[PDB]
Amino acid sequence: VLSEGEWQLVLHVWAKVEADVAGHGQDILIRLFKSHPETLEKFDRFKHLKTEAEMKASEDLKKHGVTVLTALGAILKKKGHHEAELKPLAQSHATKHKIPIKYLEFISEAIIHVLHSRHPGDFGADAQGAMNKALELFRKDIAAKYKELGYQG
Numbered sequence: 499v500l501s502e503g504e505w506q507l508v509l510h511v512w513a514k515v516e517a518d519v520a521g522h523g524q525d526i527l528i529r530l531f532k533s534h535p536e537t538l539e540k541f542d543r544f545k546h547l548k549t550e551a552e553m554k555a556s557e558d559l560k561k562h563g564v565t566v567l568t569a570l571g572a573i574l575k576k577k578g579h580h581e582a583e584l585k586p587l588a589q590s591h592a593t594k595h596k597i598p599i600k601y602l603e604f605i606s607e608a609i610i611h612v613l614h615s616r617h618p619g620d621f622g623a624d625a626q627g628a629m630n631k632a633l634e635l636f637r638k639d640i641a642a643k644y645k646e647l648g649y650q651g
């Protein structure tokens with residue numbers, strides 16, 4: 499579990515992400531796509547984008563970045579009591595989108611990378627550690643749902 503103090507660190511940086519959800523969403527997905535190109539293959543909707551400039555110009559990509567960060571934010575704000583929000587997400591990702599747990603680890607790394615770039619002052623080592631723990635709790639809870647359904651990873 500995270501402590502109250504670690505949750506505070508997480509939500510404090512998150513409040514900053516909220517100031518520009520679209521810009522953060524975009525940078526996160528692009529980082530994911532460039533670092534792990536196999537991830538882009540899971541999106542029929544974005545597969546035609548070849549360059550970072552084409553990605554940056556895509557308004558639909560920016561819209562999806564907002565969707566992703568919006569769902570993540572609702573999870574974080576529950577501070578671990580996220581069963582209702584997590585359940586539907588795990589089911590679509592496992593059964594409909596077919597996203598391995600490892601890709602969830604890759605997007606976690608992209609979030610951390612971006613947060614680092616845009617929020618140095620609010621994103622020191624202590625905050626980075628808390629954010630990591632929160633994202634691991636998220637992945638651990640999702641992984642359990644996947645296991646139940648027969649997709650473990």
Ligand code: HEM
Pocket residue numbers: 537538540541542543565566567569570586587590591595597601602605
């Ligand atoms: C931070 C972790 C993630 C969050 C919170 C998240 C959230 C969402 C949401 C809220 C949706 C739309 C509703 C739905 O279908 O459930 C969605 C759709 C989808 N997600 Fe995720 N997602 C995450 C990770 C990923 C990653 C790692 C991938 C691929 C590598 C993935 C691929 C998909 C695809 C393929 C769709 C359908 C997009 C479309 O065509 O409309 N997601 N995601």
